[PDB]
Amino acid sequence: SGSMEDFVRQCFNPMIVELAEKAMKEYGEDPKIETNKFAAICTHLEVCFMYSDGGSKHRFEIIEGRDRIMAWTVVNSICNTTGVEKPKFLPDLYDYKENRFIEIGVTRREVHIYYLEKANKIKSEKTHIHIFSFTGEEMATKADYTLDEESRARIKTRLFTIRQEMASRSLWDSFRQSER
Ligand SMILES: O=c1cc(-c2ccc(O)c(O)c2)oc2c([C@@H]3O[C@H](CO)[C@@H](O)[C@H](O)[C@H]3O)c(O)cc(O)c12
Ligand SMILES: [Mn+2]
Ligand SMILES: [Mn+2]
């Protein structure tokens, strides 16, 4: 789906597109062939960055996007300084205000299905899950949404805009049905 490749390179900042290309090739996947997955990885990374800008200065440490050594440097450091237990898998963010790791989900499916999958693969009581969709729906652990409605609205409106531009290019149907 090379027209989706064109969309991704036009839609996302070059720093995001470059990181997503690297991430896919690390798993032997070709961004030029799995173009729907490339778009999905760019979207999740953009959401993670928008979320980290969503509250007070330095509220959040970003873990997603970092090379593995630096990501685990951030996590092991945080788990020595704040004493919070050590996750088995790298989470997306750490929230200094609530003293918890956050896992961010972005889904073309239903939020409840994706929430349960994240909860099950995580198996760690401490990690806060926040799920976004392209349709305006969000859902978070204990209905605790972490950010104010205005910052969440920026994220939800950004995902809608992406869905709308995909739809105008007849890319949305394939993209929505690509997720597994
Ligand atoms: O770097 C990666 C990061 C993640 C990823 C996904 C969700 C998160 O919440 C998350 O923190 C990280 O997913 C990747 C996937 C797949 O990306 C699909 C769409 O994001 C997912 O639906 C699939 O399950 C994934 O395997 C690849 O194929 C390749 C990759 O390099 C990556
Ligand atoms: Mn992640
Ligand atoms: Mn995530």
Residue numbers in the entry: -2 to 53, 73 to 196
Paper quotes:
RdRP comprises the subunits PA (polymerase acidic protein), PB1 and PB2 (polymerase basic protein 1 and 2). Subsequently, the PA subunit cleaves the RNA strain approximately 10–13 nucleotides downstream from the 5′-cap to acquire the cap/primer. The PA subunit is a bridged binuclear metalloenzyme with an N-terminal domain (PA-Nter) harboring the endonuclease active site that carries out cleavage of the RNA segment. The active site is a negatively charged pocket that accommodates either Mg2+ or Mn2+ ions, with stronger affinity for the latter.
Using X-ray crystallography, we solved structures of the wild-type PA-N-terminal domain and its I38T mutant in complex with orientin at 1.9 Å and 2.2 Å resolution, respectively. Thanks to its high inhibitory potency and aqueous solubility, orientin (PDBe ligand USE) was soaked into the unoccupied protein crystals. Two metal ions were embedded in the endonuclease active site. The majority (0.8 occupancy) proximal ion was Mn2+, coordinated by four protein atoms (Nε2His-41, Oδ2Asp-108, Oε2Glu-119, O Ile-120) and two hydroxyl groups from the 3′,4′-dihydroxyphenyl moiety of orientin. The distal ion was coordinated by Oε2Glu-80, Oδ2Asp-108, the 4′-hydroxyl group of orientin, and three water molecules (W1, W2, W3). Ligands in both structures form a hydrogen bond with Oε2Glu-26 at the C-7 position. The previously observed high affinity of luteolin for PA-Nter is likely to be enhanced by the additional hydrogen bonding network surrounding orientin’s glucosyl moiety. This was observed in both protein variants, as most of the water molecules in the first solvation shell are located at similar positions. Wild-type Ile-38 moves orientin towards the solvent and differs from the mutant variant with an RMSD of 0.466 Å.
